[PDB]
Write an enzyme that holds these catalytic residues in place. Sequence first.
Site, PDB file in Angstrom:
ATOM      1  N   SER A 195      19.403  43.077  10.265  1.00  0.00           N
ATOM      2  CA  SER A 195      19.916  41.837  10.150  1.00  0.00           C
ATOM      3  C   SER A 195      18.596  40.881  10.672  1.00  0.00           C
ATOM      4  O   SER A 195      17.368  40.972   9.857  1.00  0.00           O
ATOM      5  CB  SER A 195      20.912  41.390  11.187  1.00  0.00           C
ATOM      6  OG  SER A 195      21.774  40.434  10.837  1.00  0.00           O
ATOM      7  N   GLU A 322      28.195  43.877   2.774  1.00  0.00           N
ATOM      8  CA  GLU A 322      27.470  43.055   3.954  1.00  0.00           C
ATOM      9  C   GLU A 322      28.528  41.847   4.283  1.00  0.00           C
ATOM     10  O   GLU A 322      28.450  41.337   5.564  1.00  0.00           O
ATOM     11  CB  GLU A 322      26.306  42.622   3.193  1.00  0.00           C
ATOM     12  CG  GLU A 322      25.311  43.592   3.056  1.00  0.00           C
ATOM     13  CD  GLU A 322      24.690  44.125   4.355  1.00  0.00           C
ATOM     14  OE1 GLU A 322      25.164  43.699   5.524  1.00  0.00           O
ATOM     15  OE2 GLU A 322      23.746  45.017   4.378  1.00  0.00           O
ATOM     16  N   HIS A 435      28.441  45.117   7.272  1.00  0.00           N
ATOM     17  CA  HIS A 435      27.175  44.698   8.047  1.00  0.00           C
ATOM     18  C   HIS A 435      27.115  45.419   9.513  1.00  0.00           C
ATOM     19  O   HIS A 435      28.079  44.953  10.406  1.00  0.00           O
ATOM     20  CB  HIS A 435      27.225  43.039   8.080  1.00  0.00           C
ATOM     21  CG  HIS A 435      25.925  42.886   8.537  1.00  0.00           C
ATOM     22  ND1 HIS A 435      24.846  42.543   8.011  1.00  0.00           N
ATOM     23  CD2 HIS A 435      25.870  42.199   9.796  1.00  0.00           C
ATOM     24  CE1 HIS A 435      23.948  41.842   8.715  1.00  0.00           C
ATOM     25  NE2 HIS A 435      24.308  41.731   9.748  1.00  0.00           N
TER      26      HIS A 435
HETATM   27  C1  LIG Z   1      30.581  31.494  14.849  1.00  0.00           C
HETATM   28  C2  LIG Z   1      31.082  33.220  14.840  1.00  0.00           C
HETATM   29  C3  LIG Z   1      29.739  34.125  14.806  1.00  0.00           C
HETATM   30  C4  LIG Z   1      29.821  35.489  15.168  1.00  0.00           C
HETATM   31  N1  LIG Z   1      28.820  36.402  14.761  1.00  0.00           N
HETATM   32  C5  LIG Z   1      27.799  36.975  15.854  1.00  0.00           C
HETATM   33  C6  LIG Z   1      26.577  36.338  16.180  1.00  0.00           C
HETATM   34  C7  LIG Z   1      25.756  35.964  14.680  1.00  0.00           C
HETATM   35  C8  LIG Z   1      25.780  34.626  14.112  1.00  0.00           C
HETATM   36  N2  LIG Z   1      24.983  34.438  13.065  1.00  0.00           N
HETATM   37  C9  LIG Z   1      24.632  36.131  12.675  1.00  0.00           C
HETATM   38  C10 LIG Z   1      23.902  36.789  11.724  1.00  0.00           C
HETATM   39  C11 LIG Z   1      23.880  38.112  11.543  1.00  0.00           C
HETATM   40  O1  LIG Z   1      23.019  38.650  10.449  1.00  0.00           O
HETATM   41  C12 LIG Z   1      24.134  38.819  12.609  1.00  0.00           C
HETATM   42  C13 LIG Z   1      24.767  38.303  13.628  1.00  0.00           C
HETATM   43  C14 LIG Z   1      25.232  36.949  13.740  1.00  0.00           C
HETATM   44  C15 LIG Z   1      29.277  37.618  13.794  1.00  0.00           C
HETATM   45  C16 LIG Z   1      29.635  38.889  14.593  1.00  0.00           C
HETATM   46  C17 LIG Z   1      29.658  40.233  13.914  1.00  0.00           C
HETATM   47  C18 LIG Z   1      28.266  40.867  14.431  1.00  0.00           C
HETATM   48  C19 LIG Z   1      27.501  41.601  13.494  1.00  0.00           C
HETATM   49  C20 LIG Z   1      28.087  42.744  12.741  1.00  0.00           C
HETATM   50  C21 LIG Z   1      29.542  42.330  12.185  1.00  0.00           C
HETATM   51  C22 LIG Z   1      30.803  42.628  13.440  1.00  0.00           C
HETATM   52  C23 LIG Z   1      30.750  41.062  14.171  1.00  0.00           C
END
Ligand SMILES: CCCCN(CCc1c[nH]c2cc(O)ccc12)CCC1CCCCCC1
Length: 526
Positions: A195, A322, A435
């Site tokens: 990521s 993804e 993902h």
């Molecule tokens: C506004 C809500 C943001 C929540 N988010 C968490 C923080 C985040 C913001 N932008 C991102 C971009 C990425 O590639 C990975 C993580 C993040 C996604 C949570 C996920 C984590 C990665 C694997 C999937 C399971 C739940």
Amino acid sequence: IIIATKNGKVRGMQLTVFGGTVTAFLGIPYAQPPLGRLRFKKPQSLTKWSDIWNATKYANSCCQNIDQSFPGFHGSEMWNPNTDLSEDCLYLNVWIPAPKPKNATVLIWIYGGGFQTGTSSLHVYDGKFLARVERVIVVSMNYRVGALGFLALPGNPEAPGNMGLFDQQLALQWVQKNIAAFGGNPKSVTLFGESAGAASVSLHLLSPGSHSLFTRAILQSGSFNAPWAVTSLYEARNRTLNLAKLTGCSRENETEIIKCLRNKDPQEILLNEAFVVPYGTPLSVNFGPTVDGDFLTDMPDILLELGQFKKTQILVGVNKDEGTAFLVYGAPGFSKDNNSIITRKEFQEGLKIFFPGVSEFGKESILFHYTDWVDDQRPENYREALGDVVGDYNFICPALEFTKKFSEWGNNAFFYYFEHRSSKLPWPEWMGVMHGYEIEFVFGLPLERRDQYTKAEEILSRSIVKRWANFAKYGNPQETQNQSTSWPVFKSTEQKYLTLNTESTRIMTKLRAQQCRFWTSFFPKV
Ligand SMILES: CCCCN(CCc1c[nH]c2cc(O)ccc12)CCC1CCCCCC1
Ligand SMILES: *[C@@H]1O[C@H](CO[C@@H]2O[C@@H](C)[C@@H](O)[C@@H](O)[C@@H]2O)[C@@H](O[C@@H]2O[C@H](CO)[C@@H](O)[C@H](O)[C@H]2NC(C)=O)[C@H](O)[C@H]1NC(C)=O
Ligand SMILES: *[C@@H]1O[C@H](CO[C@@H]2O[C@@H](C)[C@@H](O)[C@@H](O)[C@@H]2O)[C@@H](O[C@@H]2O[C@H](CO)[C@@H](O)[C@H](O)[C@H]2NC(C)=O)[C@H](O)[C@H]1NC(C)=O
Ligand SMILES: *[C@@H]1O[C@H](CO[C@@H]2O[C@@H](C)[C@@H](O)[C@@H](O)[C@@H]2O)[C@@H](O[C@@H]2O[C@H](CO)[C@@H](O)[C@H](O)[C@H]2NC(C)=O)[C@H](O)[C@H]1NC(C)=O
Ligand SMILES: *[C@@H]1O[C@H](CO[C@@H]2O[C@@H](C)[C@@H](O)[C@@H](O)[C@@H]2O)[C@@H](O)[C@H](O)[C@H]1NC(C)=O
Ligand SMILES: *[C@@H]1O[C@H](CO[C@@H]2O[C@@H](C)[C@@H](O)[C@@H](O)[C@@H]2O)[C@@H](O)[C@H](O)[C@H]1NC(C)=O
Ligand SMILES: CC(=O)N[C@H]1[C@H]([C@H](O)[C@H](O)CO)O[C@@](O)(C(=O)O)C[C@@H]1O
Ligand SMILES: *[C@@H]1O[C@H](CO)[C@@H](O)[C@H](O)[C@H]1NC(C)=O
């Protein structure tokens, strides 16, 4: 038990793994704690110590906001920090095989989390299995995230941007000056990350100050050309000024703004990070990498296009679904607790969540390209389409484009398509091969027979671990012994890639060709 490093002695601990032993040094500091007048600056070099530093527990995690959307749910909470948050967070970890190796290849992990979250102490990043099974050394580091890691006033050394990337770089430096004392080979260092960690790795391939600090690179589900990975000079400034206004730190002398932001508690900075953008998405990277003139000398799309990067082998890949994970953090009609059969109107509403500043014509053009059904009666049609939209635009197509462009300058590249759903996955079935859920296979967690994974998953992890290790040692991610499918090089003409699953490994060509022509060659014009 005790290793002399250039800054002092560190004491490790002994771990029992698979009827064998790994030595772990958890929490070695690699920089001056970026506290007080050091907040927002580049990381400063660490002064010597005379005692024995006890590196027997994971250190503090860097300050960050936490996912609270699913309290008590292991699917979201396994990604939240598992050590105290503190600005005093610049530490790293080393796992070395026992007995001490002589000249072991080193694997350096850089975690993701959107440049706003993440930490090296997470269970799914435990390096002790790779050390035990493949006799490599595994290093991981904490680096600053969010505004504390990437606030930008370009040119101003009080807040120049890209601090988190310079944290990672200082850790790579530490491995160069110190890893031979642990039995490691500083001339055989492979960066790997997922990521935003993978985007970081791709930027180290671009930054001249990282070129002598590693050999090869592995990019899992990410690269710098993904639409979320680089904040613009324009945006970064609007965001820096918005944070100053939100904290009562609006000043005219730009340096006095930073001074004011240095007397705020970390908690006040974290609360206001979400709001610096008028319209955010679940994928929003409020404070991320910028063109700072130091780490990054030009816009990275230009450097990629014109061959200005470290010439070496890369291993790149992505997961089958993804996009799905992000649909339950805002898209209407979705839920991890039902099958999320959405209508056409909910689909269109979802594009507004994920493309908030895009024109009406642009959103129609997405709808047009992803709603030409092979069967218009399947009720999951729109649910799957929005996941594919989000995954293709944010991850799969940028990674494929990075691999084509990189390989065009003559280096061997290898591309994988991971499509196994973990049997222990706590998210519902409609989200597929999510993902972030290849990571545990890369780190060899299914090799632990006690951990409720199937035996087919033990075989898949075992083979991936070998391929990753052979890539780091020899530039070539083959499994040469158990009559495995040979992984061909990805060339820009034929675009062969390897699929990773428990059934049959297959060689395929031109992944998501039709979809990625839309995202890479039409959608940028809107
Ligand atoms: C506004 C809500 C943001 C929540 N988010 C968490 C923080 C985040 C913001 N932008 C991102 C971009 C990425 O590639 C990975 C993580 C993040 C996604 C949570 C996920 C984590 C990665 C694997 C999937 C399971 C739940
Ligand atoms: C440890 O091994 C290195 C060689 O590392 C290999 O070569 C790299 C280019 C890269 O392909 C790695 O993945 C490889 O594992 C030894 O480096 C040699 O050092 C001598 C110093 O006398 C120098 O003259 C040689 O040119 C170096 N060889 C290469 C290939 O660069 C190093 O000496 C070994 N050290 C120990 C303690 O075993
Ligand atoms: C650039 O910044 C301005 C200012 O953002 C506002 O102030 C921040 C503290 C934060 O709370 C934002 O959410 C605020 O909106 C943005 O201008 C605002 O735009 C929205 C809608 O686009 C509008 O409703 C507000 O009234 C505007 N406020 C002001 C003071 O102009 C602007 O959108 C940002 N982005 C761009 C591309 O210009
Ligand atoms: C799937 O669930 C969503 C989310 O609803 C919430 O979670 C459910 C598991 C359940 O416990 C609900 O009570 C919760 O509110 C459903 O979307 C909601 O639908 C209502 C209409 O009844 C609407 O007013 C809400 O705005 C919707 N919420 C969101 C976040 O979109 C959806 O209808 C469910 N779909 C299926 C097929 O079951
Ligand atoms: C650092 O650690 C020293 C030794 O640790 C002790 O011995 C080993 C075998 C383990 O059993 C460990 O749990 C013990 O605590 C301590 O003597 C020393 O005080 C420590 N230093 C600091 C500053 O805490
Ligand atoms: C390869 O397979 C090992 C066990 O399989 C046995 O050995 C191979 C060489 C064949 O003869 C096969 O028929 C046998 O069942 C595993 O222990 C080993 O971990 C595997 N290696 C990898 C990299 O997957
Ligand atoms: C809050 C809630 O109702 N959770 C339910 C979970 C989750 O929805 C899924 O595992 C996806 O998160 O699914 C169950 O079927 C299960 O796995 O035994 C039962 C449980 O009631
Ligand atoms: C801003 O303040 C700093 C610190 O007092 C000073 O060095 C700098 O010259 C000032 N710049 C302007 C434009 O006032």
